[PDB]
Design a protein around this ligand. Sequence first.
Ligand SMILES: CCCC[C@@H](CN[C@@H](CCCC)C(=O)N[C@@H](CCC(N)=O)C(=O)N[C@@H](CCCNC(N)=[NH2+])C(N)=O)NC(=O)[C@@H](NC(=O)[C@@H](NC(C)=O)[C@@H](C)O)[C@@H](C)CC
Length: 99
Amino acid sequence: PQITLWKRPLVTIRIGGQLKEALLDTGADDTVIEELNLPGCWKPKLIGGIXGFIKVRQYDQIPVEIAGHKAIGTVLVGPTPVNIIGRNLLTQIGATLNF
Ligand SMILES: CCCC[C@@H](CN[C@@H](CCCC)C(=O)N[C@@H](CCC(N)=O)C(=O)N[C@@H](CCCNC(N)=[NH2+])C(N)=O)NC(=O)[C@@H](NC(=O)[C@@H](NC(C)=O)[C@@H](C)O)[C@@H](C)CC
């Protein structure tokens, strides 16, 4: 599909068997999702942006479907204000910027 940028590029994702809404963010290196449990598998990380840093739980090799496209990769979990799909998964679904 093609997504224009007149409004925030929000899409439905599936993760850990749960459906969420997330923002496709080309300015994010990584993917950041709120709450939800998961694997006895995670390790600590700090990630930053405007306003500084938050502590997150890094989970590896997590299956994540995005607009019907299967991806599998690192997912960071913490108190992000907005669920974010970053380049680590956008590359797996063949996403490009075009102008
Ligand atoms: C400045 C750092 C690079 C750009 C920034 C864009 N992320 C979005 C995330 C959405 C908000 C949680 C953002 O900050 N958007 C702001 C940009 C400022 C702006 N005014 O446009 C925004 O839209 N802010 C809205 C409010 C939130 C809107 N978004 C939304 N509701 N979805 C605004 N009006 O204030 N990327 C990031 O914040 C990511 N940071 C990174 O990718 C890198 N970190 C650093 C420090 O560069 C990497 C080394 O970790 C985060 C997610 C970690 C992977």
